[PDB]
Amino acid sequence: SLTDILSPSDIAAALRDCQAPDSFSPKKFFQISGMSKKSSSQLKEIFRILDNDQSGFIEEDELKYFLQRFESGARVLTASETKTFLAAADHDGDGKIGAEEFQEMVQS
Ligand SMILES: [Ca+2]
Ligand SMILES: [Ca+2]
Numbered sequence: 001s002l003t004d005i006l007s008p009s010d011i012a013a014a015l016r017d018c019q020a021p022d023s024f025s026p027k028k029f030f031q032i033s034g035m036s037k038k039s040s041s042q043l044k045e046i047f048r049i050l051d052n053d054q055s056g057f058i059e060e061d062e063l064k065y066f067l068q069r070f071e072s073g074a075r076v077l078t079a080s081e082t083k084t085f086l087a088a089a090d091h092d093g094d095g096k097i098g099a100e101e102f103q104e105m106v107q108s
Contacts, residue, residue: 001072002049005042006033011070019067022078026085030106033070040103047099057096060086 001008014032018024030036035043050069052062064082067074077085089097089105 002046002070005038005045006035010034015067015071015074019071019074021075022080024081026088026105036107038106040107043103043106044099047097047102050097055096057094057098058102059096063097
């Protein structure tokens with residue numbers, strides 16, 4: 001569990017909010033949690049937890065586990081979820097999220 005940036009009650013509320021598949025969104029998890037409220041530097045601490053390759057980015061193969069970061073056991077993302085999130089953070093057309101194009105997708 002993160003517990004290094006956002007509060008638990010805020011996460012547990014955002015998880016159940018749209019726990020169902022293709023029910024949540026990349027820009028609909030900062031209202032219940034409070035990611036945007038965090039600085040671009042604080043939003044990076046999470047990226048280091050999403051990198052299941054330690055390469056430096058969060059490819060789709062590791063982005064589908066977005067629900068496995070706040071729940072640590074929940075289901076993965078679909079072609080209608082991962083794609084969106086990637087098209088909301090990456091915007092570079094690389095298929096991998098970075099620590100420079102992530103925060104931007106949060107606050108902005
Ligand atoms: Ca990686
Ligand atoms: Ca990228």
